Amino acid sequence: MNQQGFVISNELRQQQSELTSTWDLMLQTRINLARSAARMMMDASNQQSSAKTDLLQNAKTTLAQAAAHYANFKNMTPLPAMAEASANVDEKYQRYQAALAELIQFLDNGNMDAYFAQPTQGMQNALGEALGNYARVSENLYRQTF
């Protein structure tokens, strides 16, 4: 009973903390890719490999890091109050995660057109918005416990 008002608080914290993390790494994959293709563009400098080293490799890491963070969120089932806001973020993460994953395939094999053809911004926009919605319900899921 009463003392159970501590396991709900901690969960809201961890579930949310997990989202801030994931989001970060995602936008932390987007720039590595960006910084990756940039140099992949018509230029020289690091004449090593052939479209796959440091920067490209770091995005493969960041996205994997975000995903592990996310898998936790996906695991520990939410609450009947975080229900909707949850499936929504999952729904948007699904798309934006797939998106970056593919961006990684392209840069990987040299698919510059494809890499630059993908409508990523909006994929990111949707999740960001869906993240704001969830953050709104989450932070609010306490403004009635006094």
Swiss-Prot record:
Location of the protein in the cell: Cell inner membrane
Similarity-based family: Belongs to the methyl-accepting chemotaxis (MCP) protein family.
Entry function: Receptor for the attractant L-aspartate and related amino and dicarboxylic acids. Tar mediates taxis away from the repellents cobalt and nickel. Unlike in E.coli tar, it does not mediate maltose taxis. Chemotactic-signal transducers respond to changes in the concentration of attractants and repellents in the environment, transduce a signal from the outside to the inside of the cell, and facilitate sensory adaptation through the variation of the level of methylation. Attractants increase the level of methylation while repellents decrease the level of methylation, the methyl groups are added by the methyltransferase CheR and removed by the methylesterase CheB.
Protein name in UniProt: Methyl-accepting chemotaxis protein II
Taxonomic superkingdom: Bacteria
Region (The 3 Arg may form a positively charged pocket, which binds the alpha-carboxyl group of the attractant AA): 30-39
Periplasmic side: 2-146
Residues shown, of full length: 36 to 180 of 553
Species assigned in the record: Salmonella typhimurium (strain LT2 / SGSC1412 / ATCC 700720)
